[PDB]
Design a protein around this ligand. Sequence first.
Ligand SMILES: Cc1ncsc1-c1ccc(CNC(=O)[C@@H]2C[C@@H](O)CN2C(=O)[C@@H](NC(=O)C2(F)CC2)C(C)(C)SC[C@H]2CC[C@@H](CN3CCOCC3)CC2)cc1
Lengths: 102, 143, 88
Amino acid sequence: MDVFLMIRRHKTTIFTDAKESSTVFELKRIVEGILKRPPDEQRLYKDDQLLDDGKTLGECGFTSQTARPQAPATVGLAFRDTFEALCIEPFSSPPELPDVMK
Amino acid sequence: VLRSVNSREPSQVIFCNRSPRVVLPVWLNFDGEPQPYPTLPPGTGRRIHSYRGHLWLFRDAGTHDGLLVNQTELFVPSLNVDGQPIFANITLPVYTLKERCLQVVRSLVKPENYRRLDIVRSLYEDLEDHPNVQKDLERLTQE
Amino acid sequence: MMYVKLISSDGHEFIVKREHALTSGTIKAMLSTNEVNFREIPSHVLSKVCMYFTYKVRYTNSSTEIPEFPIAPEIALELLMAANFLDC
Ligand SMILES: Cc1ncsc1-c1ccc(CNC(=O)[C@@H]2C[C@@H](O)CN2C(=O)[C@@H](NC(=O)C2(F)CC2)C(C)(C)SC[C@H]2CC[C@@H](CN3CCOCC3)CC2)cc1
């Protein structure tokens, strides 16, 4: 079963998919091919909880229900001798509804 | 050209709604004229009696957005094997992003107010070109 | 696989598979660096466009039942304008 993710750091968002049974470590390998940073320089998070490399993505809570292509799950990322604090900048705010759409 | 054939050969079918929409089954009669049948709520199935060579299409009941049946536009009942019913699995197509946006905007804006929206005039025309069975039949006939 | 960077008006960077981005004929023409800037598309729209790319590739020509692509009313009009421009 595939899971679909947004890997987010600062103002960077990576759209990618992975297996529920694949590991946090295998996901850092994905991130490396894209962002050219080694796994040992990455920290991946679900919400505010840091994720262990050995754990499977499903175990961390990324599943078909939570990580769909139309509504992807967010994985937080922090790079490093000291690892930075997890920071994800939000997307912009939609305008007010036009009156004819109310 | 697109019309049901008066085979008189019964064919039992499961209309299976695998879509989030209320589905309107549409039967093309022997003159090619579309006839509406009872609607199916999301997540429901019904065993129905139809005939070989008959033509059916499926649409959203409220908006007439086109739906797919066994991954295509038209469903034609065939001969039942083993007393098994033929399944007609009704699903959403993968709409283009533009068409899906048009669906949502039409759902929110009365047609009289389309021209109040601050968008290019060609999108007023796209919004006014509501989906409808008759035009799709003409497209399918020409294909 | 190959990835491209799509950048919103408010400066968000969206990294997506190239095959997914090529869903838009507009983006293909704009690519042909590996980065594309959209001066008129903010991130609350362009993020939803990238979700659509993922949705289209996964479910096109698939027999699994297809979920609805969700669109909040508050983004619907801007997303329509972006979809018109991107031809997807
Ligand atoms: C519950 C449900 N949920 C979604 S659909 C659905 C449903 C509900 C009823 C069925 C009965 N089944 C058919 O009506 C199949 C279907 C199509 O194949 C045409 N058809 C025939 O029966 C044709 N007859 C012939 O071809 C012959 F007699 C062999 C020569 C006709 C149409 C020339 S005469 C049939 C008579 C009696 C039945 C009414 C059906 N009314 C009208 C629509 O509103 C309620 C139902 C129509 C006039 C089927 C599906």
